[PDB]
Design a protein around this ligand. Structure first.
Ligand SMILES: NC(=O)C1=CN([C@@H]2O[C@H](COP(=O)(O)OP(=O)(O)OC[C@H]3O[C@@H](n4cnc5c(N)ncnc54)[C@H](OP(=O)(O)O)[C@@H]3O)[C@@H](O)[C@H]2O)C=CC1
Ligand SMILES: NC(=O)C1=CN([C@@H]2O[C@H](COP(=O)(O)OP(=O)(O)OC[C@H]3O[C@@H](n4cnc5c(N)ncnc54)[C@H](OP(=O)(O)O)[C@@H]3O)[C@@H](O)[C@H]2O)C=CC1
Ligand SMILES: CC1(C)N=C(N)N=C(N)N1OCCCN(Cc1ccccc1)c1ccc(Cl)cc1
Ligand SMILES: CC1(C)N=C(N)N=C(N)N1OCCCN(Cc1ccccc1)c1ccc(Cl)cc1
Ligand SMILES: O=c1ccn([C@H]2C[C@H](O)[C@@H](COP(=O)(O)O)O2)c(=O)[nH]1
Ligand SMILES: O=c1ccn([C@H]2C[C@H](O)[C@@H](COP(=O)(O)O)O2)c(=O)[nH]1
Lengths: 536, 529
């Protein structure tokens, strides 16, 4: 029966990255303070969250806490409040006008200072066993260790912390004090929040837990689930013990899990099929993922992704290009296999030159309906410039339900190296904000989708910028959602990884026409990721 | 009160008997001493799970409230006829404290180690003795009748058998103001009939990982910031349902979402809408036909529109001479002139659905030209892919021809279909760019559900899921009062579609090959004024 379960002693902290190819682990976020204050100016969303955790109380759950604490000890007002506990330097960093922390029982550890050194209404204690004494004598909901790196150190080495409410600030600052390295045998992460932007930085909230190493309408649920097939004669021959970490998290709110949960769904429930190659897949039909581009760039973190190649693909599209050599000469090999003599001949394109990919995305975006000749032709003022038209509808008719860019030209399919997977983009504008749906007919979950999420997220930012709009939601509709069999083992590794706060994307702000972007106009700041996974 | 105190529940299954609909549609209980239907086996299964199930760590709180009033099994209570109607092999219903109502036959008469009672009241005492989880009235018309009169029923566990059967005995009209529905299950096919499971209730006139939930909601919308200017009050029946598992809730929940969180915008026509972006509804065509039951929908017009598309027509008059007027407004001199189609004959709708489906890339001329073997017959093609190459990820039927949008009376709402085949079953996704949730979507669901069945049948496949992906989803501001009325109606179990099984060419359907079966619906709603 451990002290920290009876007295409900939690730690809450926020850690940035410090000035240290780069390896990343959970020690990456470890920077606590600098010269006796915080390393960052304001991160107001961290304060709002801090406020919410340290001030939240539930009177109904108090009676069971009181009984519990009175039991363990062999045994005023009633306006229930939490206790907070501060190193003295912690306490001397707090602006005067906020002391003591409102609606919280403030406790400060000091040797140099005694109660007569304070005006405030704070409990002063010499020592830790003095907090345990006080907590046995107070009516309080929960006790939060607000730190000082010294306070954090002594509280974990005494195994007095039940959980750590740990905030990952996904930027770097100068630090002189650090949070101790959390022992993974002693603490495991059980919950990871959504990812937000506050004060020009992304952040998320994770919870580490100390490791053990009317209720009529409760029953209606079980009646109503009477037909359910899964007794667990595993539909698909993937095992539980393999996703031990994935399955052990309670709150999986990081948006990366929108993509990770579909791979779980395809693996646990997919239909076994033998696609065009013979490879074999598990497949499902119909999914939506939504990413909040105002809060992050959804580059997956559970594996390393490089975006030079897909950014140069998006610029190639926008220029209207179909010349596979242009990508090959920038050492981008995305379309190399689809432009071989063999691949083209096998597509019955016997009169198509090597790397002439025919009327693919770029052609359809700038010239839909023009007769395709060859990758070198001047197609100016031929066919519909869809791209130009959709920028025009966003600018001048934002409320239009007809702002779509369509790659799927039915007449041209057989003349393309292969029919496009990104069928269409629709756009939606409300209150100065651009959202985008892309519908993908065919979705390689292990290899393709992660880049696809990136391409269309970058594209949405570009259309938003050139239209004087802010980006909102990139919405990804997956039709035929498949995991290739020989990706499965890699995907089992990736799923047992815990996402890191997303990075951000900065477009050079001077670019104002969609045509005027170059590779140097794109910056991915603060990409924290697990190491690369070769999907085979 | 007795019933809340003693956990006295009725379980029944009521078919329709041999025009306007209400809950008392579903009354048929029995016929000639047996049930009115041969064997509906999803219901027999439900009836087990419900009447066996008991919770270990909860009878503590009923040892409480029943004896604070004055392995553990369940009590069941059946009349003699209800007891005799049972075959011999299942008596006394296994794992259950069997019991009977009988003024006549006693325990020395009857077979195994049941219980008997002779007064309705005499039950009260027997329960006051026994150790039991919950008490179920399996009934007979007569047993049910006198238990509802005497106000002894906490909850009714009522199966809606959605077919018609000869009946001699019935269930009591369920007293509308004395009971209300608190839960409604998924819809199911079983033994060639749809059925759902609703729950009537009596009206009255490791919990740390729970606080973590509140912390993670720290940045949510509060009450002033649950955006919009509709009320809680007005959707009280919608809001009172705990379990909303009937698939119509996929449509209703989107209306609720748009009303409550929708962005106020002022579209094209100066009209006003609440708008969201990106939804996905999925309907199990193998289990029901998703024709909205919270109001009356008619399908002849949208079935004719579908046949019209399949024939490749663009001629608005063909529809107008069958009094299908879906496209009338889009064919007027005025509407064509405002689309800058000054040189388009009235009701010449241009290269719309039909033309793209059967002639994609052909130069449109007029609605009367012969276009045989011109452009890409996507419809013939997607059918040949399903039959020759079902694992293809290229089975798309696309109406959004970018070359032709300006020539169209208007661009299509229904951008494309994509098909999926697994294990001789056909699913269809339709991506809808523009979604009027009040008028359009209800019809749009039916159109593409029917289409899926048509494509499945000419391909010798069983239809599986219709998946409706909404892009710009909007409620017209002046549909709001109508939809509020609609949200507070409990869906009925869906109907079924019978296609004439002889039709094996998509081109060979006629209006008489389409039959809707057992359509039970709440009344017509004018969506406007
Ligand atoms: N990023 C974050 O989440 C947080 C960052 N911070 C930052 O942390 C830094 C301050 O931390 P750090 O320098 O360790 O200092 P601390 O806040 O941990 O202050 C340590 C002081 O607390 C007293 N103390 C600690 N333990 C005891 C004990 N057991 N008994 C008696 N006194 C005790 C001593 O006071 P005395 O010296 O008078 O005897 C000690 O000098 C600042 O930069 C602050 O802004 C603070 C909290 C959270
Ligand atoms: N749809 C459904 O879910 C169900 C349908 N059924 C159907 O219902 C039909 C038969 O039931 P219904 O006509 O009621 O017959 P019941 O099964 O209810 O049996 C009636 C008998 O129960 C006894 N009884 C009733 N009230 C009292 C009382 N107040 N005090 C003492 N005894 C009482 C009498 O038996 P006695 O003769 O001993 O005096 C009465 O004749 C059949 O078709 C059966 O299959 C049955 C169950 C479920
Ligand atoms: C605030 C912070 C960094 N965030 C999390 N998640 N966990 C913590 N332990 N941190 O809190 C430090 C507590 C002291 N603090 C630090 C502070 C804030 C601003 C400027 C200097 C110091 C503070 C100041 C004012 C109020 Cl109202 C509440 C807490
Ligand atoms: C069974 C039925 C119709 N279904 C629901 N949902 N609710 C009821 N109250 N009904 O229960 C009647 C009990 C008699 N019966 C039904 C029956 C069976 C065959 C012929 C006539 C009646 C029966 C037989 C075997 C078992 Cl395991 C359980 C119930
Ligand atoms: O941007 C792309 C391009 C291709 N694919 C995958 C999907 C399929 O695995 C394959 C395309 O093959 P078909 O679906 O065209 O047969 O490539 C993607 O996931 N994303
Ligand atoms: O099959 C259809 C056709 C139209 N609409 C609705 C969507 C809009 O309310 C309007 C179409 O006008 P635009 O979206 O093209 O502006 O009609 C539908 O919901 N379904």
């Amino acid at each position: 029966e451990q002290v920290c379960d009876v007295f409900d002693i939690y730690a809450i902290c926020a850690c940035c990255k410090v000035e240290s190819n780069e390896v990343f682990n959970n020690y990456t976020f470890r920077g606590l303070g600098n010269k006796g204050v915080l390393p960052w100016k304001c991160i107001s969303l961290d304060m709002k969250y801090f406020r919410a955790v340290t001030t939240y109380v539930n009177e109904s759950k108090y009676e069971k806490l009181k009984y519990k604490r009175c039991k363990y000890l062999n045994k005023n007002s009633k306006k229930l409040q939490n206790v907070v506990v501060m190193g003295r330097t912690n306490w001397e960093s707090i602006p005067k006008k906020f002391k003591p922390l409102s609606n919280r029982i403030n406790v400060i550890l000091s040797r140099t200072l005694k109660k007569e050194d304070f005006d405030e209404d704070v409990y002063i204690i010499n020592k830790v066993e003095d907090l345990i004494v006080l907590l046995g004598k107070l009516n309080y909901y929960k006790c939060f260790i607000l730190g000082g790196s010294v306070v954090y150190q002594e509280f974990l080495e005494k195994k007095l912390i039940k959980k750590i409410y740990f905030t990952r600030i996904n930027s770097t600052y100068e630090c002189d004090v650090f949070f101790p390295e959390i022992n993974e045998n002693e603490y495991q992460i059980i919950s990871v929040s959504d990812v937000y932007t506050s004060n020009n930085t992304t952040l998320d909230f994770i919870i580490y837990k100390k490791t053990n190493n009317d209720d009529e309408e409760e029953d209606d649920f079980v009646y109503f689930n009477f037909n359910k097939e899964k007794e667990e004669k595993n539909k698909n021959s993937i095992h539980p013990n393999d996703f031990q970490i994935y399955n052990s998290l309670k709150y999986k709110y990081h948006p990366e899990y929108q993509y990770l949960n579909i791979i779980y769904d395809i693996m646990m429930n997919g239909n076994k099929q033998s696609d065009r190659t013979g490879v074999g897949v598990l497949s499902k039909f119909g999914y939506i993922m939504k990413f909040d581009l105002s809060q992050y760039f959804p580059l997956l973190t559970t594996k390393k992704l490089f975006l030079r190649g897909i950014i140069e693909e998006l610029l190639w599209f926008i220029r209207g290009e179909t010349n596979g050599n242009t990508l090959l000469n920038k050492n981008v090999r995305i379309w190399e296999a689809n432009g071989t003599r063999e691949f083209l001949d096998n597509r019955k394109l016997f009169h198509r030159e090597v790397n002439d990919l025919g009327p693919i995305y770029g052609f359809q975006w700038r010239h839909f309906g023009a007769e395709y000749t060859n990758m070198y032709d001047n197609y100016e003022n031929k066919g519909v410039d869809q791209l130009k038209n959709i920028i025009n509808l966003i600018k001048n008719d934002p409320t239009s339900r007809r702002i779509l860019l369509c790659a799927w030209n039915v007449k041209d399919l057989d003349q393309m190296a292969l029919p496009p997977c990104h069928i269409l983009c629709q756009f939606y504008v409300f209150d100065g904000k651009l959202s985008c749906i892309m519908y993908q007919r065919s979705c390689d979950l292990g290899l393709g989708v992660p880049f696809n999420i990136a391409s269309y997220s970058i594209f949405t930012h570009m259309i938003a910028q050139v239209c004087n709009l802010q980006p909102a939601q990139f919405i990804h509709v997956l039709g035929n959602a498949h995991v290739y069999n020989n990706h499965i083992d890699s995907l089992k590794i990736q799923l047992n990884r815990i996402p890191y706060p997303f990075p951000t994307l900065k477009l050079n702000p001077d670019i104002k026409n969609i045509e005027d972007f170059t590779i140097s106009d794109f910056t991915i700041q603060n990409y924290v990721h697990h190491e690369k996974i070769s999907m085979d």
